[PDB]
Each structure stands twice: as structure tokens, then as C-alpha cells.
Amino acid sequence: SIRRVLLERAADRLVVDLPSAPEVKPGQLLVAGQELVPGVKLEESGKVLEINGKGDNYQLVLRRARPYRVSPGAVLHIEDGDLVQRGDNLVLLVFERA
Numbered sequence: 001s002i003r004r005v006l007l008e009r010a011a012d013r014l015v016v017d018l019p020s021a022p023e024v025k026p027g028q029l030l031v032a033g034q035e036l037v038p039g040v041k042l043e044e045s046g047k048v049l050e051i052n053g054k055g056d057n058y059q060l061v062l063r064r065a066r067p068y069r070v071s072p073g074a075v076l077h078i079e080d081g082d083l084v085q086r087g088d089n090l091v092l093l094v095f096e097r098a
Helices: none
Strands: 013-018 035-037 046-052 058-064
Touching: 013 035
Parallel strands: none
Antiparallel strands: 013 058, 046 058
């Protein structure tokens, strides 16, 4: 019995238009703000799915992906593959509070 099923919305996908050949391959996780064109940087982070384009313009479709850094020594409550909800606890960090 399947607990959670996600549906990838079409509006949740972003399309990015650029006039030069990018530096990407399908399968790389990218952080927003870094270089795609000299002078142009993409505004929202995420993973690239497919590249469409030939000539003087490129169509770069996206899927939104927000990264989260974990500290060495953190207790992980979940692994990769299962699905999380909004506000769902994933990790526990150890720290010193003043």
C-alpha cells in the first residue's frame, strides 16, 4: 500500500531562455545565481531535465529543487527515495546554544 504519491505540476516546471550554449548535462543539480551565460544568471535553483535548442536560442526546462546543508554528525530521519511534505522534519542537528 503506497502512502504518498506526488504529481509533478506543469506550472511547477520553469523554462529558461538563453541565447548561447549552456554548460549543463541532464542530471546535474544546480544552485541559483551561478553562471549560465556571461551576463545572465538564473533566478531559481533546481535540476535540469532536458535541453531543447539549436541555433541562436536555447530552451532550458527546469524542475525546482531547494538544497539543504547538513552538519557532520547529524541524525537523519529519512533516506533518499521517499517523499516529504511541507514542514516535514528530515534531519536533527547538534549545536551549542548561547
